[PDB]
Amino acid sequence: VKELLEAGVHFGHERKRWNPKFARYIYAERNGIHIIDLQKTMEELERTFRFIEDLAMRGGTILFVGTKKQAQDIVRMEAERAGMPYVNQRWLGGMLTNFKTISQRVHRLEELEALFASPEIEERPKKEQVRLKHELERLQKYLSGFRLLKRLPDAIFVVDPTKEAIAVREARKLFIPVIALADTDSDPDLVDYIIPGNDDAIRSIQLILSRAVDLIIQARGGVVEPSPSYA
Amino acid sequence: LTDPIADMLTRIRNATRVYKESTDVPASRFKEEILRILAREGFIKGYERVDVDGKPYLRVYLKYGPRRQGPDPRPEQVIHHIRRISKPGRRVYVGVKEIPRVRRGLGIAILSTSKGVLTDREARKLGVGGELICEVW
Amino acid sequence: DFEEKMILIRRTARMQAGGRRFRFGALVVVGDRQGRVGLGFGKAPEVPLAVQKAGYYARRNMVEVPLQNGTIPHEIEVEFGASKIVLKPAAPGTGVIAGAVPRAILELAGVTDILTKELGSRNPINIAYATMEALRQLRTKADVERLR
Amino acid sequence: GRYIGPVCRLCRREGVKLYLKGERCYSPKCAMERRPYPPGQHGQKRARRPSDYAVRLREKQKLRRIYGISERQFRNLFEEASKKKGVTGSVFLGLLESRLDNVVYRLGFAVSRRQARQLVRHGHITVNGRRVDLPSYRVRPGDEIAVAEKSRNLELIRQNLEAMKGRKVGPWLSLDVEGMKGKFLRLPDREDLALPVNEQLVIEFYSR
RNA sequence: CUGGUCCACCCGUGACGCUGAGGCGCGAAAGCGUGGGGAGCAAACCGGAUUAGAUACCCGGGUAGUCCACGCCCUAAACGAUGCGCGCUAGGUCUCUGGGUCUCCUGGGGGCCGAAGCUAACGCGUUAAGCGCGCCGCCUGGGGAGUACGGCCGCAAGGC
RNA sequence: AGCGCCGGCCAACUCCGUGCCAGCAGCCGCGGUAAUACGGAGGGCGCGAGCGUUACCCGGAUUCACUGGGCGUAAAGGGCGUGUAGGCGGCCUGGGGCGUCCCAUGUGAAAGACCACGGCUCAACCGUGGGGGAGCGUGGGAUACGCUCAGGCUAGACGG
Ligand code: SF4
Ligand SMILES: [Mg+2]
Ligand SMILES: [Mg+2]
Ligand SMILES: [Mg+2]
Ligand SMILES: [Mg+2]
Ligand SMILES: [Mg+2]
Ligand SMILES: [Mg+2]
Ligand SMILES: [Mg+2]
Ligand SMILES: [Mg+2]
Ligand SMILES: [Mg+2]
Ligand SMILES: [Mg+2]
Ligand SMILES: [Mg+2]
Ligand SMILES: [Mg+2]
Ligand SMILES: [Mg+2]
Ligand SMILES: [Mg+2]
Ligand SMILES: [Mg+2]
Ligand SMILES: [Mg+2]
Ligand SMILES: [Mg+2]
Ligand SMILES: [Mg+2]
Ligand SMILES: [Mg+2]
Ligand SMILES: [Mg+2]
Ligand SMILES: [Mg+2]
Ligand SMILES: [Mg+2]
Ligand SMILES: [Mg+2]
Ligand SMILES: [Mg+2]
Ligand SMILES: [Mg+2]
Ligand SMILES: [Mg+2]
Ligand SMILES: [Mg+2]
Ligand SMILES: [Mg+2]
Ligand SMILES: [Mg+2]
Ligand SMILES: [Mg+2]
Ligand SMILES: [Mg+2]
Ligand SMILES: [Mg+2]
Ligand SMILES: [Mg+2]
Ligand SMILES: [Mg+2]
Ligand SMILES: [Mg+2]
Ligand SMILES: [Mg+2]
Ligand SMILES: [Mg+2]
Ligand SMILES: [Mg+2]
Ligand SMILES: [Mg+2]
Ligand SMILES: [Mg+2]
Ligand SMILES: [Mg+2]
Ligand SMILES: [Mg+2]
Ligand SMILES: [Mg+2]
Ligand SMILES: [Mg+2]
Ligand SMILES: [Mg+2]
Ligand SMILES: [Mg+2]
Ligand SMILES: [Mg+2]
Ligand SMILES: [Mg+2]
Ligand SMILES: [Mg+2]
Ligand SMILES: [Mg+2]
Ligand SMILES: [Mg+2]
Ligand SMILES: [Mg+2]
Ligand SMILES: [Mg+2]
Ligand SMILES: [Mg+2]
Ligand SMILES: [Mg+2]
Ligand SMILES: [Mg+2]
Ligand SMILES: [Mg+2]
Ligand SMILES: [Mg+2]
Ligand SMILES: [Mg+2]
Ligand SMILES: [Mg+2]
Ligand SMILES: [Mg+2]
Ligand SMILES: [Mg+2]
Ligand SMILES: [Mg+2]
Ligand SMILES: [Mg+2]
Ligand SMILES: [Mg+2]
Ligand SMILES: [Mg+2]
Ligand SMILES: [Mg+2]
Ligand SMILES: [Mg+2]
Ligand SMILES: [Mg+2]
Ligand SMILES: [Mg+2]
Ligand SMILES: [Mg+2]
Ligand SMILES: [Mg+2]
Ligand SMILES: [Mg+2]
Ligand SMILES: [Mg+2]
Ligand SMILES: [Mg+2]
């Protein structure tokens, strides 16, 4: 499932703005930039995917987090495709560590879908319609990929662990294992199942997250053919 | 440099605490004999005489526990603790009957005796005492 | 369920105009007398809520203490800030010889025989944690060999 | 000497019947049966949480009050136990048990340890033949604890001997009624007595 | 005229090293002795203001002194409030000065931010306040008091 | 049958009297008209031919720290160098065996103390037996580390 010229796709990036624990995943540094050893990326993609597989084939949830503008859209696609939750927009504080309270907000979200499907009163004032609807779009913006989470994920997949340090933090306090793609600006030891690759180029964000979702469906019940990628 | 021995033990502690695979200490047929205890008792994987810039060293291969669950995934140490007892400032010697039981047996006290470098267990076995080099657990 | 002891309950205060305003702090240890203890410090605008909340966190933070004939496996020393705790193995008759704080933890953990000493700052809170983090570092003959 | 006062208040303070009387202990005219709250003006007031100190004092006082023994004598035994091999809590209870006046009350010759004292003190008792009127005689294994021959024929001791006929007596004792004599078999395993005492809390009282 | 120090070469010596109670030297300013010198500045001092008052702050004056030579004094928030030497434990950016194959690497300094770790915290963090060895100095509640007495130093002030 | 105590530490609570008075007090602190804190009282707690106070010793005090502390801001780095004594000191190899370590043996009185037993009706007290020790003399032995002598080295240091 794994493919090999991801070299055409990413080979990583970032100049000495690096974290030095990431030393082991580096072949050399080129155009004043850290160049990620793909042979290591391989060793890892395997061991990571093995974990991913077992989790799919036991029907266990993955939380997908990415909000850096680059990996932003491709998590709505790729996660819906896996029929799994994600946070696309802002990563609210305490989503895992204070789950039940955050979710108490999704009941509100549902409750608006129900109320605003119609009618059960449109004899409520004009302002209130406006007010309530504005709220509705709101929850929808952050909470959309979140509602699929009815229980604490059995794992979480993150695009930038540095950028999503809070996320990795919340998981570790819960023992929720962490999967992440991570370029050279990252603390490796902080990840359980790790994908040492460029995390800023959508070429790469694409390949890795897709093949992830692919392995997710392929072992879950079915197989599928190409999914959406912006050029 | 005033204490080659402490220097070694410290080179280790310092390394072990940032989880290096190895660290090299300047070689000594006495330092070796201590590493020959440190590995045998299973505190280190072991050592090998190497060379750095033409100069004799002992590269020492460090050992730890599993990765761990929790927000601090760093593994437990195998050498939790290692510290000089006898020092050049104050030589510390014990008769056999007064060799300490480190950590209720779970750790050792390496000792230079005139029957070579031994552990508490080993010393008590051959029934001799000596300078108490240090303690590990 | 678990067995519960209140080690400490204290009132704190903060100023603002018009007067001081209080809050309460509940240091609670909780255990099964058979190898499981938990320490939790809980604060709230009133006393029992704090004692409740204390007990809540107390469970959300536990430790598996390797009892051995009712004693601990080896000598152990721990410093938490300026507080120090000493734990030392004791034979069958000895009893638990300790101040309330590290006592309350050791009894509800099912220690029945130990020699202890507080050194340094004897602030109960810090002593509490220092005794916990201590227990948490106890190793068994096995634990060691598996490790090594 | 020993306590020698109102003895019901003791039980009431301890919150437990201690069987310090003999007969009346078992009737519904027992104090603890009528008023199982502490003696004096304030017993009905709601108790406030006893301190750690409080708790261990009480446990010690209780164990001590049972045997009606002076605090010095109690202490000296406990120390004796802390030098003596093994588990102090055991040995302490054991050594407390091997006292004459207790053994006599244990072997049933009297209704109260209080009564079992005056019995030893009035020379009505013997050990291995010889007369002994010391309430504190530490009795060893093998010892024959008789009634005085000249005392065998007495009302009180009769009535009290009669109440013993088929009552079974601790695993560490034998009682030969009519023969009026008994035997100290061994020092009591802890189980062999079932006193309302966490004797552990006692060791803890003296380690402060 | 003269000291320290760094680099490069890896040529010479062969542990010749570290610290250091005493001792010896150096030690800002003010001060002191003798002799110069004296524009500006300026304790003391005079006067004007300010002010309830104003032996101050502010304004006009002003002598020691400030400057030089020689001899004293020997203090300090003499501070990084951090003793010296060595070894070990991520890096990031700025900078000074060398040597390089001159993108970049390697020394020696000066700053910032930070891994681990420390720490009561504040903060420290290869310029450690981290982990260690050696030696030295020092602390042991506040005041009384750096006072008294004694001793040693000083011309005195005063110092230890 | 007495004596101390009953605010917290610390086990033991109510009434009256008093009203920053009289008084308590080991520390924190009590008393200014509803004092569990003064005095009496009832009651309670602790000990008991004793109970309390004062004095002194060790303890708690890891608060002189060997075990077992410290010095940026809490008390605590000498103003800085230079250097005497001292303390301390890199890698390799031999001799010596001073430290160190082992064995043997002498000494380590008796009492006391510790374990066992036994005698005074118990105990205290007292007796018999047992168990050793550090430390020091003597004989023998070991040689890793420290030492010392001897011979090598170049990573410390010094020099070109
Ligand atoms: S048990 Fe015997 S002694 Fe205790 S109260 Fe009832 S009667 Fe009095
Ligand atoms: Mg990034
Ligand atoms: Mg030591
Ligand atoms: Mg365990
Ligand atoms: Mg503390
Ligand atoms: Mg500390
Ligand atoms: Mg044991
Ligand atoms: Mg305290
Ligand atoms: Mg009974
Ligand atoms: Mg208790
Ligand atoms: Mg005992
Ligand atoms: Mg009974
Ligand atoms: Mg004691
Ligand atoms: Mg050369
Ligand atoms: Mg010097
Ligand atoms: Mg000097
Ligand atoms: Mg000067
Ligand atoms: Mg001057
Ligand atoms: Mg001057
Ligand atoms: Mg003058
Ligand atoms: Mg002059
Ligand atoms: Mg002049
Ligand atoms: Mg004027
Ligand atoms: Mg005027
Ligand atoms: Mg003026
Ligand atoms: Mg002027
Ligand atoms: Mg002028
Ligand atoms: Mg002029
Ligand atoms: Mg003049
Ligand atoms: Mg300055
Ligand atoms: Mg400096
Ligand atoms: Mg100073
Ligand atoms: Mg200071
Ligand atoms: Mg110095
Ligand atoms: Mg220092
Ligand atoms: Mg440069
Ligand atoms: Mg250049
Ligand atoms: Mg400089
Ligand atoms: Mg630099
Ligand atoms: Mg900084
Ligand atoms: Mg940190
Ligand atoms: Mg740096
Ligand atoms: Mg500090
Ligand atoms: Mg003073
Ligand atoms: Mg004083
Ligand atoms: Mg003076
Ligand atoms: Mg002065
Ligand atoms: Mg004088
Ligand atoms: Mg001075
Ligand atoms: Mg008293
Ligand atoms: Mg008391
Ligand atoms: Mg009380
Ligand atoms: Mg009056
Ligand atoms: Mg009144
Ligand atoms: Mg009082
Ligand atoms: Mg009163
Ligand atoms: Mg008496
Ligand atoms: Mg004292
Ligand atoms: Mg104490
Ligand atoms: Mg002391
Ligand atoms: Mg010390
Ligand atoms: Mg201190
Ligand atoms: Mg200085
Ligand atoms: Mg000076
Ligand atoms: Mg010298
Ligand atoms: Mg020397
Ligand atoms: Mg040497
Ligand atoms: Mg010798
Ligand atoms: Mg001897
Ligand atoms: Mg003797
Ligand atoms: Mg002895
Ligand atoms: Mg006898
Ligand atoms: Mg004897
Ligand atoms: Mg030799
Ligand atoms: Mg030589
Ligand atoms: Mg060199």
- Helix/strand/coil (H, E, C) string of chain D? CCCCCCCHHHHHHHCCCCCCCCCCCCCCCCHHHHCCCCCCCCCCCCCCCCCHHHHHHHHHHHHHHHHCCCHHHHHHHHHHHHHCCCCHHHHHHHHHHCEHHHHHHHCCCCCCHHHHHHHHHCCCEEECCCECCCCCCECCCCCEEEECHHHHCCHHHHHHHHCCCCCCCCCCEEEECCCCEEEECCCCCCCCCCCCCCHHHHHHHCCC
**Whether residues D4 and D79 fall in one domain:** yes
Q: B78–C73: do the CB atoms touch at under 8 Å?
A: no
| Helix or strand (DSSP H, E) at B9 | helix B4-16
Give one DSSP letter per residue of A94-163, joined into a string.
TTTTTHHHHHHHHHHHHHHHHHTTS-S-S-S-HHHHHHHHHHHHHHHHHHTTTTT-SS--SEEEES-TTT
Please list, in sequence order, all residues whose beta carbon lies within 8 angstroms of the beta carbon of residue A113, skipping any fewer than 6 positions away. A136
**Cβ contact D186:D76 at 8 Å:** no
D25 lines ligand 1 (CB under 6 A): yes
CA atoms of D111 and D7, how far apart (whole Å): 14
Q: Nearest CA to D156 among D107, D109, D205? A: D109
Output the residue whose Cα is nearest ligand 1's atom 8. D8
D141 and D79, same structural domain?
A: no
On the CB side of A165, CA atoms within 13 Å amount to: 7
Q: Is D166 in contact with D155 (CB distance < 8 Å)? A: no
CA distance linking residue D45 with residue D33, whole number of Å: 19
In D, minimum Cα distance to C92 occurs at: D87
- Asked if D104 and D152 sit in the same domain, the reply is yes
Place of tokens 């491709």: A74
| Consecutive H or E run containing A46 | helix A38-56
Q: Tokens for A171, please give them.
A: 């998981």
B71: nearest CA partner in chain A = A172
Angle between helices A99-115 and A126-143 (to 10 degrees): 130
Closest CA to A154 of A86, A62, A85: A62
How would you classify the pairing of strands C114-120 and A62-65?
unpaired
Chain breaks in chain B (C to N over 2.5 A) after: none
Which residues does D173 contact at the CB level (< 8 Å), separation at least 6? D103, D106, D107, D182, D183, D184, D185
Strands B108-113 and B55-61: unpaired
- Ligand located closest to B90 CA: 3
Angle between helices B29-38 and B4-16 (to 10 degrees): 40
Phi–psi pair at C23, nearest 5 degrees: -155, 160
Taking the CA of residue C8 and the C1' sugar atom of nucleotide F10, their distance in angstroms comes to 19
d(CA A199, CA D82): 70
Cβ separation of C100 and D204 shorter than 8 Å?
A: no
CA proximity to C48, closest of C84, C102, C97, C4 = C4
CB A167 within 8 A of CB A90: no
- Structure-token pair, residue C12: 């704190």
* Distances from the Cα of D82 to the Cα of A5, A32, D77, D91, angstroms: 79, 76, 9, 9
Contact A222, A213 (CB under 8 A): no
Do D200 and D122 share a domain, yes or no?
no
Residue B91 and residue B111 in contact, taking contact as beta carbons nearer than 8 Å: no
Closest-CA residue to D112 (of D149, D74, D66): D66
The answer to whether B34 CB is within 7 Å of strand E is no
CB C116 within 8 A of CB C90: no
Method: X-ray
Cited resolution, angstroms: 2.9
Strand locations in B1-137 (E)? 22-26, 46-52, 55-61, 82-84, 93-94, 108-113, 116-118, 130-136
The amino acid at D153: N
Q: Which helix (H) or strand (E) holds A80?
A: helix A69-81
Q: Rounded to an integer, what distance in angstroms lies between the CA atom of residue D28 and that of residue D17?
A: 12
At A180, is the secondary structure helix, strand, or coil?
Answer: strand
Contact (CB, 8 A) for D151 and D124: yes
Residues 43-82 of C with CB under 7 A from strand E: 79, 81-82
d(Cα D24, Cα D208) in Å, to the nearest integer? Answer: 38
Mutation site for C-interface testing, chosen from B44, B61, B77, B104 by largest number of C Cβ within 10 Å: B104
Query: In angstroms, what CA-CA distances link B116 with B58, B99, B126, B130?
Result: 20, 15, 11, 9
Q: Containing H/E element for B35?
A: helix B29-38
Instruction: Say if residues B108 and B42 touch (Cβ distance below 8 Å).
Output: no
Q: Which atom of ligand 1 is nearest to the CA of D24?
A: 7
Please report, for the domain that includes residue D128, its CATH number.
3.10.290.10
Residue B25: strand, helix, or coil:
strand
Quick one: which of A164, A222, A5 has its CA closest to A213? A222
Q: State the virtual CA torsion across B108, B113, B118, B120 in degrees, nearest 10.
A: -40
Same domain, D2 and D66: yes
Tokens (6 digits) for A75: 């998590």
Q: Are A170 and A94 in contact (CB under 8 A)?
A: yes
Beta strand C19-31 with C3-16: parallel, antiparallel or unpaired? Answer: antiparallel
- Cα A153 from Cα A63, distance rounded (Å): 6
Cβ neighbours of B64 (radius 10 Å): 15
Residue D95 CB neighbours (<10 A): 18
d(Cα B94, Cα B90) in Å, to the nearest integer?
A: 13
Q: Is A28 helix (H, G, I), strand (E, B) or coil?
A: strand
CA gap D43, D33 in Å, rounded: 15
Contacts of C52 (CB under 8 A, 6+ apart): C42, C44
Chains B and A touch (3+ CB pairs under 8 A): yes
Q: Count the Cβ atoms, other than its own, within 10 Å of residue B88.
A: 11
Cβ atoms C55, C91 nearer than 8 A: no
Please say whether the beta carbons of A78 and A206 come within 8 A.
Answer: no
Judged by DSSP in three states, B114 sits in: strand
Of D3, D23, D26, D32, which is best to mutate to test ligand 1, by the most ligand atoms within 8 angstroms of its C-beta? Answer: D32
Closest alpha carbon to C65 in C99, C98, C121, C110: C110
Single-letter residue type at A145? G
Q: Which of D144, D153, D135, D142 is nearest to D181 (CA)?
A: D144
D111 and D185 in a single domain? The answer is yes
Which residues have CB under 8 Å from D88's CB, separation 6+? C93, C95, D78, D81, D82, D203
Residues D115 and D80 in one domain: no
Chain C residues in contact with D199 by the CB 8 A cut-off are none
Q: From the CB of D131, is ligand 1 less than 6 Å away?
A: no
Chain B residues near residue C141 by CB distance under 8 angstroms? 105-106
Question: Which nt has its C1' nearest the CA of B113?
Answer: F144
- Cα–chain-centroid distance for residue C69? 20
Please name the chains neighbouring D, where neighbouring means 3+ C-beta pairs under 8 angstroms: C
Cα–Cα distance, D131 to D147 (Å, whole number):
9
Half-sphere exposure of C137 (CA within 13 A, CB side): 21
Instruction: Return phi, psi of residue A149, to 5°.
Output: -85, 100
Neighbouring CB atoms inside 10 A of D54's CB total 11
Q: Is D11 annotated as a binding residue?
A: yes
A73 membership: H or E segment, kind and range: helix A69-81
Whether C contacts B, i.e. 3 or more CB pairs less than 8 A apart, is: yes
Contact A129, A116 (CB under 8 A): no
Measured distance CA(A55)–CA(D34) in Å, rounded: 68
Q: Output the domain CATH number for residue D53.
A: 1.10.1050.10
Compute chain D's Rg from CA coordinates.
Answer: 18
Closest residue (CA) to C1' of nucleotide F10 is D53
Interatomic distance B84 CA / F99 C1' (Å): 20
The reply to whether D160 and D142 lie within a common domain is yes
Nearest CA in chain C to B75: C147
CA distance D104 to D65: 17
Furthest-apart CA atoms within chain B: distance in Å: 49
Q: Which two tokens stand for residue A218?
A: 């392929």
Task: Clarify whether residues D78 and D118 are in a common domain.
Answer: no
Query: Are D37 and D108 found together in one domain?
Result: no
Q: Among residues A89, A95, A73, A202, which one has the least CA distance to residue A156?
A: A95
Determine whether the annotation assigns residue D8 to a binding site. Answer: yes
**Are D207 and C95 an interchain contact pair (Cβ–Cβ within 8 Å)?**
yes
Q: How far apart are alpha carbons C73 and C88 in whole angstroms?
A: 9
Check contact D-C (3+ Cβ pairs < 8 Å).
Answer: yes
From the number of C-beta atoms within 10 Å of its C-beta (0-12, 13-18, 19+), residue C126 rates as buried
Phi-psi region of B129 (alpha: psi -120 to 50; beta: other; left: phi over 0): beta
User: By residue range, what is the domain housing residue D155?
Assistant: 97-193
Q: Is the CB of B100 under 7 A from strand E?
A: no
Tokens standing for residue C45? 């605008």
* Cβ neighbours of D186 (radius 10 Å): 13
Q: Do D131 and D60 share a domain, yes or no? A: no
Ligand 1 neighbour D145 (Cβ under 6 A): no
D58 alpha-carbon distance from chain centroid: 17
DSSP chain C: --EEEEEEEEEEEEEETTEEEEEEEEEEEEE-SSSEEEEEEEEESSHHHHHHHHHHHHHTSEEE---BTTB-SS-EEEEETTEEEEEEE--TT--EES-HHHHHHHHTTT--SEEEEEEE---HHHHHHHHHHHHTT---HHHHHHH-
Same domain, D83 and D124: no
Q: How crowded is residue D82: how many other Cβ atoms within 10 Å of its Cβ?
A: 14
How far apart CA A109 and CA A89 sit, in angstroms, is 16
Using the structure block, give the residue that is written with the tokens 């294994």. Answer: D141
Nearest atom within ligand 1 for CA of residue D21: 2
Tally the residues of chain A: 231
Domain count, chain D: 2
* Cβ B113 vs Cβ B105: under 8 Å: no
CA-nearest residue, atom 6 of ligand 1: D30
When CB atoms are compared, the residue of C95, C100, C112 closest to D52 is C100
B7: tokens are 């220097």
Distance of CA D113 to the CA centre of its chain: 6
- Say if D60 is an interface residue toward chain C (CB within 8 Å): no
Contacts of B128 (CB under 8 A, 6+ apart): B96, B113, B114, B115, B118
Non-local (6+) Cβ contacts of D83 within 8 A are none
Ligand 49 centroid–CA B5 distance in Å is: 40
Distance C130 CA to E11 C1' (A): 61
Cα separation, A181 vs A74, whole angstroms: 14
Burial-class residue A73 by CB neighbours within 10 Å (0-12, 13-18, 19+).
middle
Nearest to C97 among D52, D87, D207 (CB): D207
Estimate to the nearest angstrom the gap between the alpha carbon of B115 and the chain centroid: 18
